[PDB]
């Protein structure tokens, strides 16, 4: 995409990877093979996101009718615990390439990525009430829609009539989606329009990361800290229930994050 090494793809005119670059120059299966192979940085990070989700959805409250999952990418690790606390899930993404990988996975098509190592891992955290083939069927039955997203749009779902949600989940999304704090803050107001009053916001993402790599192809990220996200959340109409910060970072070659944040909020 012209630039090559000097600046992330689709970030020369703008200074941040434009949304177009996610539709055209983005291979989702290449990304899944890199980050979600699954005791490296990636595996340890995925294991921490998983523990936080098992605690949010299985250990604590966060029970409901409908959970809208914003910017799911081509991944399902983030929905394994919520398919126990929610009667229905509505997954979304900007990339059609990503929505495709999700739709292939809901069909159990052999050409879809293997989530077996991950699914079995979450089963072990839950005590193993069920096994992999049983856990994946609960989650697939729970996915009611796969829709196009745009957190950087007043109506994040467009014309789709969706009922108010009890939870809105977003993992590893807004750092790539928003190019500056005004957009990060606005994109959180947009998530609130999908949420019920006193409804949960669950956000997980990297801290202090300005880029992330998918091979040799580079992508933009918003380098923000704990103070920056804490402030962005509260100003967008949310009361923060708890905020976790971990020091684990992605390997040298994969991103310059100083750690990762996990937080639960409530639309107030
Ligand atoms: C693969 C992935 O890039 C997500 N993976 C990762 S792995 C990793 C590792 C380290 C750091 C980071 C990181 N990231 C996210 C960025 C930070 C993806 O699938 N994303 C995020 C970007 N996203 C959108 C783009 C533009 C506009 C959007 C509008 N609405 C909704 C979504 C939109 C689409 C879904």
Residue numbers in the entry: -10 to 27, 31 to 260
Q: What did the paper state?
A:
Nicotinamide-N-methyltransferase (NNMT) is a cytosolic enzyme that catalyzes the transfer of a methyl group from S-adenosyl-methionine (SAM) to nicotinamide (Nam), yielding S-adenosyl-homocysteine (SAH) and 1-methylnicotinamide (MNam). As was described by Peng et al, NNMT possesses a class I AdoMet-dependent methyltransferase (MTase) core fold, comprising a central seven-stranded β-sheet, flanked on both sides by α-helices.
In our case, we saw the synthetic feasibility of transferring the corresponding structural motif directly to the imino nitrogen of compound delivering compound in the process. A subsequent X-ray analysis of confirmed the binding mode as a bisubstrate inhibitor. The binding mode in the SAH pocket of the part that is common between and is identical. Further profiling on human and mouse NNMT enzyme revealed that a bisubstrate binding motif does not necessarily translate into an improved inhibitory activity. Based on our crystallographic data, we obtained the correct linker length allowing the important interactions with Val-143 and Tyr-204, and we also observed no obvious strains within the bound ligand. Our rational design towards the bisubstrate inhibitor starting from the fragment-sized nicotinamide pocket binder revealed no beneficial impact on in vitro inhibitory activity by addressing both binding sites of the NNMT enzyme simultaneously.
